[PDB]
Design a protein around this ligand. Structure first.
Ligand SMILES: Nc1ccn([C@@H]2CS[C@H](COP(=O)(O)OP(=O)(O)OP(=O)(O)O)O2)c(=O)n1
Ligand SMILES: [Mg+2]
Ligand SMILES: [Mg+2]
Lengths: 546, 397
DNA sequence: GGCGGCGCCCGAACAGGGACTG
DNA sequence: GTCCCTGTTCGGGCGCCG
């Protein structure tokens, strides 16, 4: 029917008028279904015949539903949407099964004709006019900007009393889906479910029996809910022999979806298969590393896997593991090997970074995700030594911090691969390094001068001032002994190397990192440039042939 | 009887997304908002209101009672506005929460849409529950402005009878300052509290701590290079600083560990520079139009340094925040206490909070700062990667 | 072929900030 | 001012849900 709930007042953005788009031509296979739908809707008062009084129009169409025997009616309301006021979206996230608590009795209900059972603002119906006969909407149409929010809000208002007087009943409300959980025995649970159905009916909302799930496994939000296990519905990966950008996007999206319960999913190579592409219809050749990563993902997917439900009386434990190349997998669980869920974090931040920063980022992502799903921070189990972390937190000039954690010796352990001395080294040779580049010519020079009288200058082409400073440091490191003191005038190179990176998207920085790892003691010091400070001045004069 | 409120000339209301809340805070907010809705102070709204500002809760000190805090920073930026110099000079100042008095004055109807907020749900069991204010909200620029006439009526007899006391309102709090002994001051504060019902700050220790140069009887090439770099930075602040004589001590490609005696010509220059850092910075005038900038540097081991300025190198105030060097030190907790202390000091000195440059990744701060926030206001902030040299320049021995 | 939510990943646009030219 | 480097934001694809 039509809910007796108050309507939600809607306006057009100031100054705009309704749409006046002409009806796109359709087939007969859609006209027949749309007539069959619109006759019954106009009988039920959900759409009303409009006369020549409305000057507005919008094109309509229809598509097959999840069950391919029923048609869903849609309206291309893009123009009206652009002209409709702004809404505050009220759906803040997607409920997850791992946040469900074990319940003795579970029901899943689907509201029948959800949008078409919620009325629409009278002053706004004139803008919804369409033509097949000219109708206008009296209920929420599909394709309008405001319908999801207005329905979600109306469903909340309608449920509010039932929630108020049934606190021990849990209702997960995903937009017309209703998960209903209780610890009541099956008979009294079915009684309460009847109360909830009759209550929805008093507010105009039907729960058809055909979409009334009563026995496990329940289908919900893409998962199968068993009494104390939950799984995802099967994930069919495409086996395409020629790969397009759209195909890679579908594959990576399916892999991202799978990574919530399948551990160890990696998509870095398959995603890098996108760098600077053109369109959805460009064939991409799979690199060898991408082929191997995809084979690994496939072998992961052909393995039986399930998650469990949240127990609020036991601890949240997030254990993280290092994958290669800025990739990390994690498992959230409460009892060992019984995962609540799994995840991945593979976001590359900063041109230069190390594994301690990346781990900190992962710990932050997992923390916020855990607050969203369970409302608790978890207890962490990280492959990093407490000493490693303290050393980092000491030497690092940014505020960093990680919640309660305990070390787990599962390699690859997170390590700082080198340290910079806090004081200059006695007996270590002292290299003053510098470099310069001409902006117009793009040519440059990098070199070093030592206290023992060694001098080296090396010419570079197609370089910058910053690259030329990094090259000078690289020269010094290559030519120095195991212990060295280095004096630069480059706050840029200083800041990079002081951050103690172990990986970089700059090949030069990577080579610098390998050299730094090879050394036993390094002291890096900074002097201001062009100040006559010996022997920085000697290097400066040496590398300025341009 | 309500007051009309206009927004910025060409700006809209706040559209800030609500961040995730822990179960503890959600339960407290739901309790508080039920009670407030009953009393008519807030009411439920829907998605037709296009505005939103974030809400959370903080547990008060030595208390089980949570407090709802709305982050009205965006709203406060967008409401066009409509301070005693002697408060910083008083011996004692007490901060009194007077916020809930605002809940007696109704809020203009047309403006209510802008105060919308959204209580979230654990595991998104439900869509967010949206509310808006019907009275003056705690945390909004306009609430003390509208309530100011009523507040002055409240405080007239107390000011008349106690002319030596300085009462200053900043948004949700009164700052009551005097020079009385601690006990008599507390009794006067209790007089003022009884007056409010009828309807731990000492601005002396606030030392402008200087920039100090290392004192040594033996100087390596490294030490003199560090000193010349620091002085070349500091000359951007104190132009009278010379480096010539010290810089001459370095001629040649010497080893960093090589010892260098200080020539009398250079020791006199170092002494001159040491004295120059004692006199104040010239050409530094406070500007009420331009807003305050506060930089913070993490020095390590519970030590933090900060500068408050408006234009670069014209520092209005430098300082340090020194916490205990403990085993389980929480950098985020310390930084939060530091920004609270600096903001209190700015509200007392200049009457406005500063925009903070925070030496932290944005996500760590946004994830944990609420766990340690205790004030009713919130300063503006941005996130910067502090250069390795600024910390070296402001650190202590 | 329409809509809203969240997720991921990429590149385009842009905003500081350090260093430079005559 | 210019050039270079780097971090943030946002929109465009796709994935999942209804
Ligand atoms: N792709 C989609 C899917 C759903 N929707 C919206 C949001 S929820 C609403 C569900 O459609 P209906 O109310 O007609 O109900 P159903 O299609 O499930 O059938 P019945 O339950 O049998 O009555 O349609 C959409 O806009 N786009
Ligand atoms: Mg339905
Ligand atoms: Mg240089």
């Amino acid at each position: 029917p039509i809910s007796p709930i108050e309507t939600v007042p809607v306006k057009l953005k100031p100054g705009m008028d309704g749409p006046k788009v002409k009806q796109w031509p359709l087939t007969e296979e859609k006209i027949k279904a749309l007539v069959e739908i619109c006759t019954e809707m106009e009988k039920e008062g959900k759409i009303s015949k409009i006369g020549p009084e409305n000057p507005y129009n919008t094109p309509v169409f229809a598509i097959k539903k999840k069950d391919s025997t029923k048609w869903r009616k849609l309206v291309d309301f893009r123009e009206l949407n652009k002209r409709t006021q702004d809404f505050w979206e009220v759906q803040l996230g997607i409920p997850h099964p791992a946040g469900l608590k074990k319940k003795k009795s579970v029901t899943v209900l689907d509201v029948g004709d959800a949008y078409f059972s919620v009325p629409l603002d009278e002053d706004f119906r004139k803008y919804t006019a369409f033509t097949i006969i000219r109708y206008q909407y009296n209920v929420l149409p599909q394709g309008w900007k405001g319908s999801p929010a207005i329905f979600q809000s109306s469903m909340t208002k309608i449920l509010e009393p039932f929630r108020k007087q049934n606190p021990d009943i849990v209702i997960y409300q995903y937009m017309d889906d209703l998960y209903v959980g209780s610890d009541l025995e099956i008979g009294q649970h079915r009684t309460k479910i009847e109360e909830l159905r009759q209550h929805l009916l008093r507010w105009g909302l039907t729960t058809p029996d055909k979409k009334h799930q009563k026995e496990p496994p329940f289908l919900w939000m893409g998962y199968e809910l068993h009494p104390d296990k939950w799984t995802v519905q099967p994930i069919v990966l495409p086996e395409k022999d020629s790969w397009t950008v759209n195909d890679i996007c579908k594959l990576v999206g399916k892999l991202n979806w799978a990574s919530q319960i399948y551990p160890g999913i990696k998509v870095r190579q398959l995603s890098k298969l996108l760098r600077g592409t053109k369109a959805l219809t460009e064939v991409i050749p799979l690199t060898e590393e991408a082929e191997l990563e995809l084979a690994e993902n496939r072998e992961i997917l052909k393995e039986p896997v399930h998650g469990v439900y949240y127990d609020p009386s036991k601890d949240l434990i997030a254990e993280i593991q290092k994958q290669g190349q800025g990739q990390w997998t994690y498992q959230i669980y409460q009892e060992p090997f019984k995962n609540l869920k799994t995840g991945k974090y593979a976001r590359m931040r900063g041109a230069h970074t190390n594994d301690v920063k990346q781990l900190t980022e992962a710990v932050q992502k997992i923390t916020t995700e855990s607050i969203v799903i369970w409302g608790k921070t978890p207890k962490f189990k990280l492959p990093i030594q407490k000493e490693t972390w303290e050393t980092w937190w000491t030497e690092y000039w940014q505020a960093t911090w990680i919640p309660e954690w305990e070390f787990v010796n599962t390699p690859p352990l997170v390590k700082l691969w080198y340290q910079l001395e806090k004081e200059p080294i006695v007996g270590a040779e002292t290299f003053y390094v510098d470099g310069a580049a001409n902006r117009e010519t793009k040519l440059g020079k990098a070199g070093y001068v030592t206290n023992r009288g060694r001098q080296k200058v090396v010419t570079l082409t197609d370089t910058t001032n910053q690259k030329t400073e990094l090259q000078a440091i690289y020269l010094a490191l290559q030519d120095s002994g195991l212990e060295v003191n280095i004096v630069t005038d480059s706050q840029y190179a200083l800041g990079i190397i002081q951050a103690q990176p172990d990986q970089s998207e700059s090949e030069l920085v990577n080579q610098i990192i390998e050299q730094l790892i090879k050394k036993e003691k390094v002291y890096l010091a900074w002097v201001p440039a062009h100040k006559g400070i010996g022997g920085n001045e000697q290097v400066d004069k040496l590398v300025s042939a341009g | 009887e309500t007051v009309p409120v206009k927004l910025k000339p060409g700006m809209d209301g706040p559209k800030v997304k609500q961040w995730p809340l822990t179960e503890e805070k959600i339960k407290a907010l739901v309790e508080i908002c039920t009670e407030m809705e009953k009393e008519g102070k807030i009411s439920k709204i829907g998605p037709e209101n296009p505005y939103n500002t974030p809400v959370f809760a903080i547990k008060k000190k030595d208390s089980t009672k949570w407090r709802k805090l709305v982050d009205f920073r965006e709203l406060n930026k967008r409401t066009q506005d409509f301070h005693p110099a002697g408060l910083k000079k008083k011996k004692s100042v007490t901060v009194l929460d007077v916020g809930d008095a605002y809940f007696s004055v109704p809020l203009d109807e047309d403006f209510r849409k802008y105060t919308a907020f959204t209580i979230p749900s654990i595991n998104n069991e439900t869509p967010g529950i949206r509310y808006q204010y019907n009275v003056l909200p705690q945390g909004w620029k306009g609430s003390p402005a509208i309530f100011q006439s009523s507040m002055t009526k409240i405080l007239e007899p107390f000011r008349k009878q106690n002319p030596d006391i300085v009462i200053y309102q900043y948004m949700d709090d009164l700052y009551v300052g005097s020079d009385l002994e601690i006990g008599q001051h507390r009794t006067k504060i209790e007089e003022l509290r009884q007056h409010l019902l009828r309807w731990e700050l000492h601005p002396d220790k606030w030392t402008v701590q200087p920039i100090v140069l290392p004192e040594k009887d033996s100087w390596t090439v490294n030490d003199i290079q560090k000193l010349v770099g620091k002085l070349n930075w500091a000359s951007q602040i104190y132009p009278g600083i010379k480096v010539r004589q010290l810089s001459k001590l370095l001629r040649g490609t010497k080893a960093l560990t090589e010892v260098i005696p200080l020539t009398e010509e250079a020791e006199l220059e170092l002494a001159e520079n040491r004295e120059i850092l004692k006199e104040p910075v010239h050409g530094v005038y406070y500007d009420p139009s331009k807003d305050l900038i506060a930089e913070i540097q993490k020095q390590g081991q519970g030590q933090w340094t900060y500068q408050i300025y408006q234009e670069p190198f014209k520092n209005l105030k430098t300082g340090k925040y020194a916490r205990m060097r403990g085993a389980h030190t929480n950098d985020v907790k310390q930084l939060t206490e530091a920004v609270q202390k600096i903001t209190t000091e700015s509200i007392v000195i200049w009457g406005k909070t500063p925009k903070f440059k925070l030496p932290i990744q944005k996500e760590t701060w946004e994830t944990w700062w609420t766990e340690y926030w205790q004030a009713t206001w919130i300063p503006e902030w941005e996130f910067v990667n502090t250069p390795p040299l600024v910390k070296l320049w402001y650190q202590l021995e």
